[PDB]
Design a protein around this ligand. Sequence first.
Ligand SMILES: [Cu+2]
Ligand SMILES: [Cu+2]
Lengths: 78, 278
Amino acid sequence: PAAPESFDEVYKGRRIQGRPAHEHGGGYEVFVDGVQLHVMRNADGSWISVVSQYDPVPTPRAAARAAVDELQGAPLLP
Amino acid sequence: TVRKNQATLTADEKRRFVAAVLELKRSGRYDEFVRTHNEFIMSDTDSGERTGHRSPSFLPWHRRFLLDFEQALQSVDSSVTLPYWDWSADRTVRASLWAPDFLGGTGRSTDGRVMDGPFAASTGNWPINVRVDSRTYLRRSLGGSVAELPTRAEVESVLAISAYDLPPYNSASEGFRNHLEGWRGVNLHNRVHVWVGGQMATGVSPNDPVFWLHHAYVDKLWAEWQRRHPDSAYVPTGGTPDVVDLNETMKPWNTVRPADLLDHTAYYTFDALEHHHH
Ligand SMILES: [Cu+2]
Ligand SMILES: [Cu+2]
């Protein structure tokens, strides 16, 4: 499958970024305020992440936004 | 070893389970289970090597992980066994599971912090150490991100599926394993993680002790499936790249195969498990 497009935006006050590229070897990378958020693509082309692991979302940007939603302001840890 | 429905524990059994879990936390042993789980759920991938999740070995892998945890609990209090949470039956926030004498309740709405029970951060007895963000307090949002826990009718519809698993042996599969895991269909295991919320909905989900009770019920459902389908068994049985075949060993232990874990009775029984019937 094609790699998703990169993105860069401020969402709920935090900078979220995505780009094509202990954990699998990532084909796509997401960052929240510069700290990497581990994300993974599912067979059906949806995504999850460590911060929201059991609830598929359609895109890496959706996973970034879901992570920022759940973090409620907390810094991510590498 | 009899694994009991959580709702049926006596007050003394609840006390002894809680105390053993808090001692595994105090001694540093608990957190290494969280870390192992995190490592596998971040590594198991639909297009490559997959052992603990998204694959046929999801069920034997979690069976051996829960045995390692129960053995650690028995090393503290030999009387303790892992209880299970039948979320089809005990499906509201008022269930005794969530009382302050057992796991404590939901998180408060501002920051999702659990405020009562033995695992509340205010106790000083449940630091969240293995984590993905700065917060070090247990969080939950019961029923917050998804409305309802699975029902028994939904569980029965999954137990009725005859094939243990099916190619391509990942989150896209038809078959029992992937319906129980929940990536396709009505969704059992994944949805329960989402329903609890907080750390339980993340890749460090054993930070919530309810992790073990949920997985012990998922483990029971595998046993129930086997009683419903004595004629049907683990697949695949050989030569499958990236997937653990029946006679291959599983990481991280390497000394056990799915074949060694199909029959739970070599290790424990349940309070109740129907024999095969029609
Ligand atoms: Cu799980
Ligand atoms: Cu029969």
